[PDB]
């Protein structure tokens, strides 16, 4: 039953996600790798389902077997609307995976300038380091994205 | 043929990556965890 | 992309400063050869 929700949240079947959670299917149902419906919704870029899942009380700081949150995925894959909705629903902006990588690190690395500003707005630690001691600035300088490096001083 | 490969039990879990050590020039053994980061993503198992 | 080739790390200096490929080279998309150039009525062109 919770399996159907994982598959439906991934597929973007907005209609089926509501029908399944009307039968009280586990909204924090994890797959083999530890991905919730909110992970699959954040990754594949389903805004309507992300909201519907969070309004039905989905763990916003749910983490996979490597410590990646839906915010990690949303930020990394240039999903501006989903990042905002997640952060509005109290998603740890300074969340770290098993590598020490943050939603800012990922957004910064792919050069999603709009998302970086939204993350900083909610108090994203700019000096936050990964396991290799790299900031979002270190990334921008190495990438040579001077537009992004300006925002992080 | 002669095939070298990990015994099944040492290549089943993502956490087994860190159990694998490589020898540096200075002679010290370095775990994969020291110089590598990992994350889950989606890709095709059959590209047409 | 040229962006990814540019940030290839050649070496790190003793003072911890990085030497990237873009610090010793220009990185652009360009012909395998610049040997064959065609014009159609004096206008820049390719063909088969």
From Swiss-Prot, chain C:
Intracellular or extracellular location(s): Cell inner membrane
Top-rank taxon: Bacteria
Induction line: Positively regulated by MarA, Rob and SoxS transcriptional regulators (at protein level).
Description of the deletion phenotype: Loss of susceptibility to contact-dependent growth inhibition (CDI); inhibiting cells still contact the target.
Similarity field: Belongs to the resistance-nodulation-cell division (RND) (TC 2.A.6) family.
Summary of the function given for this chain in its UniProt record: AcrA-AcrB-AcrZ-TolC is a drug efflux protein complex with broad substrate specificity that uses the proton motive force to export substrates.
Assembly and binders: Homotrimer, with large domains that extend into the periplasm, interacts with AcrA and TolC. AcrA may be required to stably link this protein and TolC. Interacts with AcrZ. Part of the AcrA-AcrB-AcrZ-TolC efflux pump.
Protein name stated in the entry: Multidrug efflux pump subunit AcrB
Source species of the chain: Escherichia coli (strain K12)
Residues of the whole record sequence present: 242 to 289 of 1049
């Amino acid at each position: 039953l919770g399996k159907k929700l994982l598959e439906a949240a991934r597929a973007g079947r907005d209609d089926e996600v509501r029908i399944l959670m009307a039968n009280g299917a586990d909204v924090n149902a994890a797959d083999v790798v530890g991905w919730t419906p909110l992970h699959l919704a954040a990754y594949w870029g389903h805004l309507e389902i992300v909201e519907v899942l969070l309004k039905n009380g989905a763990d916003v700081n749910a983490y996979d077997t490597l410590g990646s949150t839906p915010l990690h995925l949303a930020a990394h894959f240039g999903h501006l609307e989903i990042v905002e909705v997640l952060l509005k629903n109290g998603a740890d902006v300074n969340a770290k995976d098993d590598n020490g990588i943050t939603p800012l690190h990922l957004a910064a690395n792919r050069g999603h300038l709009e998302i970086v500003e939204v993350l900083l707005k909610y108090g994203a630690d700019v000096n936050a380091q990964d396991k290799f001691g790299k900031t979002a600035f270190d990334i921008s300088i190495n990438n040579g994205n001077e537009d992004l490096a300006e925002i992080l001083q | 043929k002669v095939y070298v490969m990990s015994e099944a039990k040492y290549r089943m879990l993502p956490d087994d990556i860190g159990d694998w050590y490589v020898r540096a020039a200075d002679g010290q053994m370095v775990p994969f965890s020291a110089f590598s980061s990992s994350r889950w993503e989606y890709g095709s198992p059959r590209l047409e | 992309s040229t962006e990814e080739f540019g940030k290839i790390l050649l070496k790190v200096n003793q003072d911890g400063s990085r030497v990237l490929l873009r610090d010793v080279a220009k990185i652009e998309l360009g012909g395998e050869n610049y040997d064959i150039i065609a014009e159609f009525n004096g206008q820049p062109a390719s063909g088969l």
